[PDB]
Design a protein around this ligand. Structure first.
Ligand SMILES: *C(=O)[C@](NC(=O)[C@H](C(=O)O)c1ccsc1)(OC)[C@@H]1N[C@@H](C(=O)O)C(C)(C)S1
Length: 502
């Protein structure tokens, strides 16, 4: 006859900003319309105007009400503007009710779609930060007591038994200015090279903060009608790859820490191949005999790094890679984040020793690679990763000795600045450091990973471009130019003083 029931009071989802307070996700007030069929059934002459207001066929609308004439609740539509919300309310139909709800808008849209993420139809987080910090952002909902009659007509609002608590504001580590630069330059590299996909990550080597994370393809998270799923992949965090030659500096770190190698030591790489039973190690350029350790990185000799790997043992290389976080949990607690794999064999045969040392037989993400380079640039100290603005920097872990990291930094500066090096990664006005890669998946992954300024490193960056088709595929020519252009702008946006001085 008269029954007490409780209706959920939706809560306003917390504002997401970039590190500078620019809005990235905002809760917009929407109006949801529900109906009591049992009441609607007493006012059928109003139905047609309501169907039209909801853009529905009059017969399909009517059929649906009749089919649910037993129920006391149905959604009519979720998530109208309050202006179109009022339109339907004006129609004054018995048994139509309104709930005030919230809809996310993403001001920056596709520029930061993967990082910021997406909410489902219930305003819960579903991809990216929205998912990872859903508990922070969501906000516990409210409860109001209503009286209903036996037909389920809402007679009376009685009281609020639990206040809605709004979700909490969250400032990302992302800098929208760098995020826009990275986005623009990665899109243009994708189109210039007719490539299938790519990622670019920018990290603060001192604070562990991710300043930019971008992927192609991307999508407009404000356009909830397409949802092409391949464009929704946050590739920087969920696509694993063999990193190939971008891990040679970690091989070189193991070599320098072994006590068996100094930078001026020499390896004979002639004739640019080496038989390992069934396997044959090949250098792309084979006009070399004696190379020093720096030369082995400038020419990316697989023969040279392999011979060093045989001398020092796979264990020492595995150890460095594990300590800098290759194939390791990032601690970011993004659900569905990929960890890849760094297989720890007890002893390694020669084949597996060589392939590890030049970046096959492990799987990593662009974010792990960027983090690893961050530790190398930060004098061998790994600072924990963050996707949220860091006020108080947590203690880092010394994973490579400062002398060794300093020495390898210098070698990577030579990889960029030396005769026959990756000149396309040069950053006019600054000393930049890094290493190119070109990985087989004929299908190629183009890689460049590095940091700047070499004098006092601030920024680590990774560029991954999947299946370039138009103009070659070497990391040194496809990805290096992107690193150059994004590092040119990012350093200046952060007011990092040019270090290419007397
Ligand atoms: C590292 O990435 C690199 N890559 C290769 O040797 C490739 C392979 O595995 O066959 C490759 C050779 C020709 S095209 C792809 O060594 C494991 C070397 N580093 C690359 C780079 O710096 O971009 C080279 C110079 C292409 S070879």
């Amino acid at each position: 006859a008269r029954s007490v029931r409780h209706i959920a009071i939706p809560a306003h989802r917390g504002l997401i900003t970039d590190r500078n307070g620019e809005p990235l996700a905002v809760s917009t007030p929407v109006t949801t319309l529900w109906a009591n069929p049992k009441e609607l059934m007493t006012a059928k002459e109003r139905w047609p105007q309501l169907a039209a207001a909801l853009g529905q066929d009059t017969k399909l609308f009517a059929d649906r009400i009749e089919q649910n004439a037993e129920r006391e609740f149905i959604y009519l539509v979720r998530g109208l503007t309050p202006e179109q919300g009022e339109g339907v309310i004006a129609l004054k139909v018995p048994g139509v009710y309104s709930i005030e709800e919230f809809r996310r808008f993403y001001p920056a849209g596709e520029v930061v779609a993967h990082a910021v993420g997406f909410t489902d139809v219930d305003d819960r987080g579903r991809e990216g930060i929205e998912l990872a910090f859903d508990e922070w952002l969501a906000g516990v909902p409210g409860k109001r007591q209503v009286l209903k009659d036996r037909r389920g007509r809402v007679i009376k609002d009685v009281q609020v038994t639990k206040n809605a608590k709004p979700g909490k504001t969250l400032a990302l580590s992302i800098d929208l200015r760098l995020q826009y630069l990275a986005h623009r330059e990665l899109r243009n590299a994708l189109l210039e090279n007719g490539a299938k996909a790519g990622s670019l990550v920018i990290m603060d080597v001192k604070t562990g903060e991710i300043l930019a994370m971008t992927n192609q393809p991307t999508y407009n998270p404000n356009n909830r009608r397409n949802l092409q799923p391949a464009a929704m992949r946050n590739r920087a965090m969920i696509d694993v790859f063999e990193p190939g030659s971008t891990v040679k500096p970690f091989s070189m770190s193991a070599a320098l820490a072994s006590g068996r190698w100094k930078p001026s030591d020499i390896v004979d790489v002639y004739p640019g191949t080496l038989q390992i039973g069934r396997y044959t190690i090949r250098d792309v350029s084979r006009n070399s005999r004696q190379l020093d350790l720096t030369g082995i990185l400038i020419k990316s000799s697989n023969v040279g790094i392999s011979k060093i790997a045989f001398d020092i043992g796979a264990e020492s290389i595995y150890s460095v890679m594990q300590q800098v976080g290759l194939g390791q949990d990032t601690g970011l607690g993004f659900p569905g984040e990929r960890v890849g794999n760094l297989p720890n064999h007890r002893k390694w045969p020669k084949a597996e020793t060589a392939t590890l040392a030049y970046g096959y037989g492990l799987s990593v993400t662009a974010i792990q690679l960027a983090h690893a380079y961050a530790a190398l640039a930060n004098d061998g100290k790994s600072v924990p990763l963050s996707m949220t603005r860091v006020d108080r920097v947590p203690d880092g872990v010394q994973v490579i000795s400062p002398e060794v990291a300093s020495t390898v930094q210098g070698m990577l500066q030579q990889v960029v600045e030396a005769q026959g090096g990756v000149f396309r990664a040069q950053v006019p006005g600054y000393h930049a450091a890094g290493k190119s890669g070109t990985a087989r998946k004929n299908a190629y992954r183009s890689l460049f990973a590095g940091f700047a300024p070499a004098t006092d490193p601030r920024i680590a960056m990774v560029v991954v471009i999947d299946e370039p088709s138009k103009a070659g595929y070497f990391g040194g020519l496809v990805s290096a130019p992107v690193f150059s252009k994004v590092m040119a702008g990012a350093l200046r946006l952060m007011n990092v003083p040019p270090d290419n001085l007397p």
